[PDB]
Design a protein around this motif. Structure first.
Motif, PDB file in Angstrom:
ATOM      1  N   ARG A  91       0.826  -1.205   0.000  1.00 23.04           N
ATOM      2  CA  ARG A  91       0.000   0.000   0.000  1.00 23.04           C
ATOM      3  C   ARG A  91       0.864   1.261   0.000  1.00 23.04           C
ATOM      4  O   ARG A  91       0.538   2.243  -0.664  1.00 23.04           O
TER       5      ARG A  91
ATOM      6  N   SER G  61     -11.685   6.206   3.055  1.00 26.77           N
ATOM      7  CA  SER G  61     -11.118   6.974   4.164  1.00 26.77           C
ATOM      8  C   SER G  61     -11.956   8.212   4.469  1.00 26.77           C
ATOM      9  O   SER G  61     -12.146   8.566   5.633  1.00 26.77           O
ATOM     10  N   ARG G  64     -15.134   7.091   6.223  1.00 32.34           N
ATOM     11  CA  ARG G  64     -14.828   6.781   7.620  1.00 32.34           C
ATOM     12  C   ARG G  64     -14.735   8.061   8.454  1.00 32.34           C
ATOM     13  O   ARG G  64     -15.235   8.111   9.578  1.00 32.34           O
ATOM     14  N   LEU G  65     -14.090   9.087   7.903  1.00 30.45           N
ATOM     15  CA  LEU G  65     -13.954  10.374   8.592  1.00 30.45           C
ATOM     16  C   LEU G  65     -15.295  11.082   8.776  1.00 30.45           C
ATOM     17  O   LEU G  65     -15.468  11.850   9.721  1.00 30.45           O
ATOM     18  N   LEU G  68     -17.090   9.366  11.801  1.00 30.28           N
ATOM     19  CA  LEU G  68     -16.422   9.766  13.045  1.00 30.28           C
ATOM     20  C   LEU G  68     -16.861  11.168  13.465  1.00 30.28           C
ATOM     21  O   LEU G  68     -17.161  11.408  14.633  1.00 30.28           O
TER      22      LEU G  68
ATOM     23  N   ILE H  62     -11.675   8.319  18.411  1.00 24.60           N
ATOM     24  CA  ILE H  62     -10.656   8.734  17.437  1.00 24.60           C
ATOM     25  C   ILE H  62     -10.594   7.731  16.282  1.00 24.60           C
ATOM     26  O   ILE H  62     -10.531   8.118  15.114  1.00 24.60           O
ATOM     27  N   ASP H  63     -10.582   6.447  16.626  1.00 26.06           N
ATOM     28  CA  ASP H  63     -10.758   5.365  15.657  1.00 26.06           C
ATOM     29  C   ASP H  63     -11.481   4.224  16.378  1.00 26.06           C
ATOM     30  O   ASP H  63     -11.859   4.371  17.541  1.00 26.06           O
ATOM     31  N   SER H  79      -9.919  20.667  17.646  1.00 22.43           N
ATOM     32  CA  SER H  79      -8.894  20.593  16.605  1.00 22.43           C
ATOM     33  C   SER H  79      -7.877  19.478  16.881  1.00 22.43           C
ATOM     34  O   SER H  79      -7.292  18.924  15.949  1.00 22.43           O
ATOM     35  N   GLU H  82      -9.752  16.327  15.782  1.00 20.65           N
ATOM     36  CA  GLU H  82      -9.773  16.381  14.323  1.00 20.65           C
ATOM     37  C   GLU H  82      -8.441  15.902  13.752  1.00 20.65           C
ATOM     38  O   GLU H  82      -8.412  15.090  12.825  1.00 20.65           O
ATOM     39  N   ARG H  85      -7.980  12.038  14.486  1.00 19.86           N
ATOM     40  CA  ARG H  85      -8.808  11.240  13.580  1.00 19.86           C
ATOM     41  C   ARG H  85      -8.221  11.179  12.174  1.00 19.86           C
ATOM     42  O   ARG H  85      -8.199  10.119  11.549  1.00 19.86           O
ATOM     43  N   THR H  86      -7.749  12.317  11.679  1.00 13.38           N
ATOM     44  CA  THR H  86      -7.120  12.372  10.364  1.00 13.38           C
ATOM     45  C   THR H  86      -5.830  11.554  10.357  1.00 13.38           C
ATOM     46  O   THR H  86      -5.588  10.788   9.428  1.00 13.38           O
ATOM     47  N   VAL H  89      -6.814   7.767  10.362  1.00 13.02           N
ATOM     48  CA  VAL H  89      -7.342   7.333   9.069  1.00 13.02           C
ATOM     49  C   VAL H  89      -6.277   7.418   7.974  1.00 13.02           C
ATOM     50  O   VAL H  89      -6.185   6.527   7.133  1.00 13.02           O
ATOM     51  N   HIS H  91      -3.029   7.114   8.251  1.00 17.37           N
ATOM     52  CA  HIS H  91      -2.081   6.015   8.421  1.00 17.37           C
ATOM     53  C   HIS H  91      -2.648   4.702   7.885  1.00 17.37           C
ATOM     54  O   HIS H  91      -1.916   3.897   7.309  1.00 17.37           O
ATOM     55  N   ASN H  92      -3.945   4.487   8.084  1.00 15.72           N
ATOM     56  CA  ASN H  92      -4.618   3.319   7.522  1.00 15.72           C
ATOM     57  C   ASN H  92      -4.600   3.334   5.996  1.00 15.72           C
ATOM     58  O   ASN H  92      -4.485   2.286   5.362  1.00 15.72           O
ATOM     59  N   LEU H  93      -4.717   4.525   5.417  1.00 18.98           N
ATOM     60  CA  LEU H  93      -4.689   4.684   3.966  1.00 18.98           C
ATOM     61  C   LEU H  93      -3.296   4.396   3.402  1.00 18.98           C
ATOM     62  O   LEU H  93      -3.175   3.716   2.386  1.00 18.98           O
TER      63      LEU H  93
END
Ligand SMILES: *[C@@](C)(CO)[C@](*)(O)[C@H](CC(C)C)NC(=O)[C@H](Cc1ccccc1)NC(=O)[C@H](CC(C)C)NC(=O)[C@H](CCc1ccccc1)NC(=O)CN1CCOCC1
Ligand SMILES: [Mg+2]
Lengths: 222, 231, 233, 244, 195, 240, 212, 235
Positions: A91, G61, G64-65, G68, H62-63, H79, H82, H85-86, H89, H91-93
């Protein structure tokens, strides 16, 4: 007008077993009808039991491998020396490749290693980052010669059980490291015979839980 | 007094008080020791905790396969500086296929800290660093101070009660310098050195933190049960 | 996007048992015009590296300046600049290779082919190629331009693989290089008779030879050749 | 650094007031009085010039009353220079609206935008506010005749009759006394002048110390005309109401 | 996107827009509504480059709706058309212009009159009794020149519109899968469900 | 650009600029929000030291953000316009990308986020404004009433008041509002809102504004006579 | 490619092939062209492999955001519009994508949105996308009714891909089936065309053009 | 006045030290880590009875594998959440995997000191970040505005923190069950809270490997409160 791309030839091959995975590639480097080097390795140990090769335009290939090797290094720094799994590496490579979607790396990338269950894994990429896990993949100049042979011998395609009236297929099974290396060597000797850009030498990198072993074999130099 | 509002101001006697107050943050920090021989270089660090329910603050950071440091003072500032060192080590590898000299590492840190002491708005770094490494000229140990001053040493110590360990190493200089081709003995000398800075507390299994680098030894950190050997 | 104006032709090189040899003629062509005759295309960096450059000469002179500046920069705050922390051939090459690829990636290349020949600190021979595209490769023999087509075949008869390197002496290696330069003079229309040659040995160090000439040429048989087929006179 | 010399123009007092806005209003309270009165068939704008000198050129002068477009005008109270910066902006904004929609800008929209600019100088930028209070007099086909006022805070409100500048307390009481809803323009003209005449700090109100303007539908059939009064026209209207 | 028509009659504006969405050799959809309501008494139909059309229409819609909330007031059709024209006039000299042609049908409540505006992708505005974009005009304009009268009713306008669609269905090469017809008048916007 | 950190911490752990912004809210005219069983009502005070006003054109205290959401406020009037404008733009931007109007919670969260950003951004001061945001979510009949403040914190209220003498009217609502049984009808909800303002206002003439919001974008503002009828009714029942 | 998805009485059927080509070279026969965004959302992939694979995993992604931030599953309309607004920003840059965002929510019910790289976004009941879309349409349209059973609908989607896989040179490999209901999506297996063609030929009695 | 990023003579950043005083004024938040899961609980503290307490969101996801509780100037945390959470997500991407709890905390703490004369002041809020990953298992972190984070077995932050922390010192052991940890948070919250503890003015949550991060309902917490009172009266 200046053309930023070139073709350095060569071909690569990745096969996955039950508890191992191989990534082979010839050592010849060429431009047009000239030989640049008879031994220029393009299959690399990148750490975390991941082997990689980016065949095509060598400058882009070297840049990519260099960047992935560096990505592995920073993955350790940022995540407490966690081992980069093969699926995570794949990935990450997609994002490296797609990052230059509008000025691509002219390479076919293949990585090999073990998945998180300890089973052999091979991933293959197109120049802009589309990737897929497979048991089998040939890449590069002689891919079209080697790949159909692999379909027949690794995945047993078009082979039926004798006497069953073409009704029962030949059953799939994992191959031994010995049987796989035989197929790799025969694939490259055949490709060497019929493709001008393939020859000189063959370097195979084998990946097991114990580590990364190397094997080298001579190929015809004409 | 009137000359400590910011880093851009000199006192009448020619002192930079904000830089001095940043130096004070290091003295409050937990003790850490550095020492080397000709073959290896060793970092020993006393980690500190908030209470019994908390973890022990990690003091040692790896920068490359051949270089790393220990910190004393503001930990976030050590993270910034160590990240910078990681990038400079990495630039040297990618561009020149060359391992960064430990001396250049020091020169680069000096220059980064200095810029923060001459400009309005910014502040000095509030952390002291002990950098060890093994390069083409053998083993090295550096002491970084946020004033900008970097100093190459055989051994040293920074943090609270660091004078005890620094005195010990000054006595032991002739002994530990010749501990060549023997990692465990060089660590033992470092563990005995940091022990001269202890008061009421002693070295436990999740308290001690050791790191080593040398001729045929990549920069590696030892924590937990891996340091039980040296207690 | 460029086009090369004043150009230099082949650079040839090979490994031998104790070091490396590299050579290149002293010509600066301006298309078919053989404009400049006193051009040095081998540039030493320290006492252990020689960079041979072909292609555009303006871009070559730019690279000269970069290498010159690299030596100066390395000396800064470096007490071991003439010892352990001196510039290695591998450092100099990787720097150039980084620049060449960065420039091609900005669609504004240094229109050159470069061969970095030298000896490492541990005694190992270093010989590697890089060009305007950022493509790099190494081999016992390396050559640019017409050298790739005519010199390499001759030099590979001496050192065909890795195991032939210890068996090849400096006398044999230099003889092959000098022969290759003669063949290029016969057959490359943008070559000159005058050339430079450099030897970097792990024992005897850097030997830089200037103002060499191609000699022992065969031209006598030309007098017998008459017409283009039938003509007898 | 430069922190030492910063006045901090955009901050709150412990009482929850904006220092600079309050002091700007104090500045405006010493400026010449300006009055706006809205009638059923028009609007009146009257303003007192600041202590005039006899050698001042009166006919070719503009201090208090400015034209924003054909349908909208303003009376100024405070720093003239500050007002002119804002006036040119308001003139440009009106033309932008006309260019975009092919329609003359509604009065409130122009007032809001000009008041939003003033608000900005009180919340960010670190600059002093504009020491200006406006009386907007204008017409559009939605609400008809309208009077607004804006001040350095950037707050604006609508009015039937209003005064800005000096002696607004006394002036507003007098307007509140004699104003009524069915009033005509000619009556409003008289009220405006009578109010200034009583609240003025001068000995006697004369033509040379005044600026005057009306916005009537007194043109030919369903169209609005702006009249900025000439010196002689003010002299006549002052005699006609029996002040001089 | 292909056929969009518009007819202004005595007391209303009628917009007819084809239902077909074609990509390559496939009609992907045959029930597409090529229009957006900008305000209660203003309707805009559109046609042109794929993607651009809807992106532009919705961008305009949002801006007009923002104005309506801010002022608690509906903009006149003339005002809306001028705003739309300016946006297209900016667009044509951009790095990538909107390739969208529009018709704006509206009922002005202050004047009590229907109004039809034709605006092309260059920002060329014209008020018309009847309008069309694309190849449609080459048939309908001459037909309307003949049969159109200014004092017609809404029902007469629909019959006049049926005459146009029939002609297009006879002589046009492409199958545009009929039209969605919408009427704009003093009571707002409504759709004719059986056409 | 002007960079100065105006909102900063003090030794005791307070951000005085944010707290002084609350004092500006305390100075502002009183605003009240009461939500019933099927509606929300927003009441607002208008100070009567201003006669000769033109109520046609004077900015109204309650502002529509979308067709289904309204926003009232207490504090600096000029500051409120900036928040209302931003909220209106975000409302249209949400419809454009999500193809659905904002929820009342989302709109409140956005407005609150803007207010917070101004408490730790360089060169700016906090908004001297607290808001009451009320309405109904798309395709929903449950009444929503939220409050924001200069610090950036926001929360939901069964009934709430802000502005000057808000502590008096909050005292009134705390004993008069029943959680188990809120105002069942529109009339009951409006009456309770008017009653609460009559504890503070002065006279019930042109000092009280009332705005009623009902489900499916049904918002209407009451006139003087309509409000005066509630004032007349309450006073007659009081004399007992 | 060939991909389809249609709406019917019992929800949504989604079916796709698995071939990847680089010109006339068959590069892969085992590509996953359906992306699983969440238990209630699917996305089909046609056109540029990397463009589709990269931007639809990115879409996941962003979805998912959303849940949340909003404490609620994203609508099919909102999800599709995030993708369509993304590709519109890259319009003219050369992205090649023909996607279909399929899913179920409470407010919308079963919903299918066609989204392509030139910015087109269409809600609809039936869509076929890819080089063999016309071949799939031919079979699907001629056999489609709203009142199809879950069993018959699954087969029609499978049979339509098979028809395209047969005739279109750049379609084939294997068929991947999905069924989307109120409870979420359900996978209905990988079906190799190698065995499926003959099985269908024999049982159905179709494909008489081919030498049996 | 004086610079924002100024050091005191003792060697501390004035603004960071002052932000800590703001956090002491905040409502209490407690976290306890066990081998069966991590529990997070907070004091809601409604300023008035008319305020609908269910809208007070001081525990946050958060996840799926990481949760978060806050204390101090809670508006500042928005913030930070925020960003978290970003980061999670994103890092998962990039890596097709869950992100480590420690790496997430480090990412949040990098924002902390990005202030000066970047944002104008430090955050006035502390965070308890709880989660699980395959490598280090169940974890609880305390993220301060100083940019520092400690891992904790148990931790209390807010107005009753020093009293609650002393209580957690005695009560915590390595073999605590999840149910035992739930009751222990409720017990200690009831001790330090001003008003009487119930389901409306206090909130519980947990994160387990199996079911991920879950905020408890008021019905579920009410039963745990009733179970808690009965067990204390039983001896
Ligand atoms: C049906 C199956 C076929 O049309 C579908 O439409 C599928 C969609 C699936 C794969 C998601 N599309 C393709 O199979 C698609 C066709 C295509 C090809 C090229 C451009 C656009 C569309 N195939 C691909 O995208 C392949 C994937 C291969 C099998 C790994 N990739 C390529 O063709 C790549 C990258 C294309 C590219 C796009 C934009 C910029 C740069 C490159 N190109 C090469 O591999 C080049 N080439 C192939 C042979 O080796 C020498 C170099
Ligand atoms: Mg060959």
């Amino acid at each position: 007008q200046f053309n930023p791309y070139g073709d350095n030839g060569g071909t690569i091959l990745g096969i996955a077993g039950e508890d191992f995975a191989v990534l082979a590639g010839d050592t010849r480097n060429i431009t047009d009808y000239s030989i640049n080097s008879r031994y220029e390795p393009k299959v690399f140990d990148c750490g975390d039991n991941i082997v990689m090769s980016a065949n095509g335009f060598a400058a882009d290939g070297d840049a990519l491998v260099k960047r992935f090797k560096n990505s592995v290094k920073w993955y350790h720094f940022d995540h407490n020396d966690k081992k980069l799994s093969i699926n995570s590496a794949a990935r990450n490579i997609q994002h490296l490749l797609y990052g230059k979607r509008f000025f691509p790396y002219y390479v076919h990338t293949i990585i090999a290693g073990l998945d998180e269950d300890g089973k052999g894994a091979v991933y293959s990429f197109d120049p802009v980052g589309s990737y897929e896990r497979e048991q089998c993949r040939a890449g590069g100049a002689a891919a079209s010669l080697i790949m159909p042979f692999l379909d027949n011998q690794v995945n047993f395609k078009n082979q039926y059980e004798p006497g069953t009236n073409g009704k029962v297929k030949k059953p799939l099974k994992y191959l031994s490291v010995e049987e796989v290396i035989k197929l790799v060597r025969d694939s490259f000797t055949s490709a060497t015979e019929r493709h001008i850009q393939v020859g000189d030498g063959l370097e195979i990198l084998i990946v097991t839980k114990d580590g990364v072993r190397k094997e080298f074999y001579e190929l015809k130099r004409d | 007094n009137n000359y400590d509002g910011d880093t851009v101001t000199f006192s009448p006697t020619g002192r930079l008080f904000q830089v001095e107050y940043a130096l004070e943050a290091i003295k409050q920090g937990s003790v850490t020791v550095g020492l080397r021989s000709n073959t290896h270089a060793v970092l020993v660090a006393l980690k500190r905790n908030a209470d019994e329910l908390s973890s022990y603050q990690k003091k040692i950071i790896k920068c490359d396969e051949h270089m790393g440091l220990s910190l004393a003072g503001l930990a976030p500032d050590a993270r910034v500086l160590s990240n910078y060192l990681r990038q400079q080590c990495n630039y040297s590898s990618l561009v020149f296929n060359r391992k960064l000299a430990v001396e250049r590492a020091g020169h680069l840190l000096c220059d980064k800290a200095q810029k923060n002491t001459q400009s309005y708005g910014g502040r000095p770094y509030g952390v002291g660093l002990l950098i060890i490494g093994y390069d083409k000229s053998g083993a090295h140990l550096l002491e970084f101070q946020p004033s900008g001053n970097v100093t190459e040493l055989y051994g040293t110590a920074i943090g609270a009660r660091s004078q005890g360990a620094k005195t010990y190493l000054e006595r032991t200089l002739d002994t530990f310098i010749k501990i060549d081709g023997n990692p465990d003995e060089l660590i033992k000398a470092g563990v005995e050195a940091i022990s001269q800075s202890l008061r009421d507390e002693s070295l436990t299994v999740d308290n001690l933190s050791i790191a080593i680098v040398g001729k045929d030894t990549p920069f590696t950190i030892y924590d937990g049960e891996a340091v039980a050997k040296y207690i | 996007t460029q086009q090369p104006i004043v150009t230099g032709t082949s650079v040839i090189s090979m490994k031998y048992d104790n070091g490396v040899i590299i050579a290149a003629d002293n010509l600066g062509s301006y298309g078919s015009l053989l404009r400049f005759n006193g051009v040095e295309r081998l540039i030493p960096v320290g006492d252990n590296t020689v960079v041979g450059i072909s292609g555009d000469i303006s871009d070559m002179q730019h690279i000269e300046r970069l290498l010159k500046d690299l030596v100066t920069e390395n000396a800064y705050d470096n007490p071991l600049a003439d010892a352990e922390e001196a510039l290695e051939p591998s450092y100099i090459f990787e720097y150039l290779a980084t620049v060449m690829y960065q420039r091609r990636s900005k669609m504004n290349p240094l229109w050159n082919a470069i061969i970095v020949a030298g000896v490492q600190s541990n005694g190992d021979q270093f010989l590697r190629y890089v060009n305007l595209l950022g493509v790099t490769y190494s081999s016992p023999t390396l050559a640019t331009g017409f050298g790739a087509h005519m010199a390499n075949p001759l030099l590979r008869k001496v050192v065909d693989r890795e195991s032939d390197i210890p068996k090849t002496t400096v006398q044999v290696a230099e003889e092959a290089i000098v022969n290759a330069m003669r063949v290029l003079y016969y057959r490359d229309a943008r070559s000159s008779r005058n050339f430079s040659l450099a030897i970097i040995d792990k024992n005897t160090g850097l030997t830089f030879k200037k103002n060499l000439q191609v000699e022992n040429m065969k031209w006598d048989f030309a007098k017998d050749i008459k017409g283009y087929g039938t003509q007898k006179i | 650094g430069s922190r030492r010399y910063d006045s901090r123009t955009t901050i709150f007092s412990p009482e929850g007031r904006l220092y600079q806005v309050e002091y700007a209003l104090e500045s405006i309270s010493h400026a010449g009085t300006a009055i706006g009165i809205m009638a059923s068939d028009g609007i009146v704008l009257a303003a007192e010039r600041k202590v005039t000198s006899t050698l001042l050129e009166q006919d070719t002068s503009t201090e208090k009353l400015y034209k924003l477009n054909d349908k909208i005008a303003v009376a100024v109270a405070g720093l003239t220079a500050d007002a002119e910066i804002l006036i040119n902006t308001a003139r440009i904004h009106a033309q932008n609206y006309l260019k975009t929609y092919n329609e003359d800008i509604p009065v409130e929209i122009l007032v809001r935008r000009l008041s939003d600019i003033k608000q900005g100088y009180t919340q960010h930028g670190g600059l002093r506010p504009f020491g200006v209070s406006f009386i907007y007099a204008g017409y559009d086909d939605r609400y008809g005749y309208q009077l607004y006022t804006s001040n350095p805070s950037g707050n604006y409100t609508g009015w039937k009759a209003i005064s800005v500048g000096a002696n607004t307390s006394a002036a507003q009481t007098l307007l509140q006394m004699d104003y009524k809803d069915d009033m005509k323009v000619d009556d409003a003209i008289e009220l405006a002048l009578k109010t200034l005449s009583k609240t003025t700090d001068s000995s006697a109100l004369t033509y040379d110390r005044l600026e005057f303007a009306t916005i009537r539908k007194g043109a030919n059939d369903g169209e609005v005309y702006q009249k900025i009064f000439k010196p002689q026209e003010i002299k006549d209207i002052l005699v006609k109401t029996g002040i001089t | 996107m292909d056929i969009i028509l518009g007819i202004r009659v005595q007391d209303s504006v009628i917009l007819a827009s084809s239902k077909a969405v074609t990509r390559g050799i496939s009609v992907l959809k045959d029930s597409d509504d090529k229009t957006r309501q900008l305000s209660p008494h203003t309707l805009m139909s559109f046609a042109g480059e794929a993607g651009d059309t809807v992106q532009f229409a919705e961008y305009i819609q949002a801006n007009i709706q923002l104005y309506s909330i801010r002022e608690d007031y509906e903009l006149s059709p003339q005002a809306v058309s001028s705003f739309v024209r300016q946006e297209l006039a900016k667009s044509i000299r951009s790095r990538r212009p909107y390739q969208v042609n529009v018709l704006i049908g509206g009922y002005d409540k202050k004047k009590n009159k229907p109004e039809l505006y034709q605006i092309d992708y260059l920002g060329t505005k014209v008020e018309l009794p009847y309008g069309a974009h694309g190849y449609s005009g080459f048939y309908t304009f001459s037909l309307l020149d003949h049969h159109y009268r200014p004092d017609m009713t809404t029902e007469e306008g629909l019959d006049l519109l049926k005459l146009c669609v029939q002609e297009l269905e006879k002589r046009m090469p492409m199958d545009f899968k009929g039209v969605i017809v919408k009427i704009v008048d003093k009571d707002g916007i409504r759709q004719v469900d059986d056409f | 650009g002007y960079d100065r950190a105006l909102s900063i911490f003090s030794p005791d752990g307070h951000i005085f600029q944010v707290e002084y912004a609350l004092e500006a809210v305390k100075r502002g005219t009183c605003a009240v929000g009461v939500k019933g069983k099927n509606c929300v009502v927003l009441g607002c005070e208008r100070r009567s030291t201003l006669k000769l006003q033109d109520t046609r054109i004077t900015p109204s205290k309650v502002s529509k953000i979308d067709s289904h959401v309204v926003l009232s406020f207490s504090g600096l009037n000029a500051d409120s316009r900036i928040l209302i404008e931003k909220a209106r733009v975000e409302a249209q931007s949400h419809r454009l990308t999500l193809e659905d109007p904002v929820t009342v919670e989302y709109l409140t969260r956005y407005v609150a986020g803007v207010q917070q950003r101004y408490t730790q951004s360089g060169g700016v001061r906090p908004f001297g404004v607290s808001t009451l945001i009320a309405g109904f979510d798309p395709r929903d009949d449950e009444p929503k009433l939220y409050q924001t403040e200069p610090s950036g914190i926001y929360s939901s209220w069964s009934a709430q008041t802000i502005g000057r003498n808000s502590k008096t009217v909050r005292e009134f609502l705390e004993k008069n509002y029943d959680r188990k049984e809120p105002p069942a009808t529109v009339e009951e909800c409006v009456k309770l809102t008017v009653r609460s303002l009559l504890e503070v206002v002065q006279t019930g003439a042109k000092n009280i504004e009332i705005t009623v919001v009902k489900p499916d974008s049904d918002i209407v503002a009451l006139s003087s006579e309509e409000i005066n009828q509630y004032v007349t009714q309450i006073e007659q029942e009081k004399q007992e | 490619t060939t991909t389809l998805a249609f709406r019917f009485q019992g929800g949504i059927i989604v079916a796709v092939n698995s071939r990847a080509t680089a010109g006339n070279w068959v590069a892969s026969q085992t590509v996953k062209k359906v992306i699983e965004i969440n238990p209630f959302l699917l996305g089909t992939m046609a056109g540029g492999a990397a463009d589709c694979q990269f931007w639809e995993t990115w879409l996941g992604s962003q979805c998912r955001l959303h849940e949340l931030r909003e404490k609620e599953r994203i609508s099919v309309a909102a999800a599709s519009k995030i993708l369509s607004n993304l590709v519109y920003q890259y319009k003219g840059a050369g992205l090649s994508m023909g996607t279909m965002i399929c899913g179920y929510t409470r407010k919308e019910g079963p919903t299918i949105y066609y989204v392509d790289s030139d910015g087109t976004r269409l809600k609809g009941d039936i869509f076929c996308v890819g080089s063999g879309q016309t071949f799939a349409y031919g079979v699907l349209d001629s056999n489609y009714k709203w009142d199809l059973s879950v069993e018959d609908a699954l087969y029609l989607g499978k049979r339509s891909i098979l028809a395209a896989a047969h005739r279109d040179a750049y379609s084939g490999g294997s068929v991947n089936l999905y069924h989307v209901t109120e409870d979420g999506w359900i996978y209905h297996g990988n079906h190799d065309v190698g065995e499926l063609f003959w099985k269908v030929k024999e049982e159905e009695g179709s494909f008489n053009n081919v030498i049996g | 006045d004086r610079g924002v990023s100024t050091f005191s003579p003792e060697g501390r950043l004035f603004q960071v030290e002052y932000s800590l005083e703001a956090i002491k004024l905040g409502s209490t938040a407690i976290g306890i880590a066990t081998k069966e899961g991590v529990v997070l609980g907070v004091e809601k503290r409604a300023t008035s009875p008319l305020l609908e307490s269910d809208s007070i969101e001081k525990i946050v996801e958060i996840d799926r594998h990481i949760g978060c509780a806050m204390s101090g100037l809670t508006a500042d945390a928005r913030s930070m959440i925020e960003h978290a959470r970003t980061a999670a997500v994103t890092h998962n991407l990039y890596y097709d995997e869950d992100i480590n709890v420690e790496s997430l905390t480090q990412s949040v703490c990098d924002l902390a000191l990005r202030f000066g004369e970047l944002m104008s002041r430090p955050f006035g809020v502390a965070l308890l970040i709880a989660g699980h990953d395959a490598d280090d298992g169940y974890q609880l972190f305390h993220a301060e505005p100083s940019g520092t984070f400690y891992r904790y077995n148990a931790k209390a932050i807010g107005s009753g923190s020093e009293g609650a922390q002393a209580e957690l010192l005695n009560e915590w052991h390595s073999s605590l069950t999840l149910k035992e940890a739930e009751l222990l948070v409720l017990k200690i919250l009831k001790q330090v809270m001003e008003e009487k503890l119930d389901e409306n003015n206090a909130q519980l949550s947990c994160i387990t490997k199996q079911d991920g991060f879950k905020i408890y309902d008021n019905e579920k917490t009410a039963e745990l409160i009733k179970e808690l009172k009965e067990k204390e009266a039983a001896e």
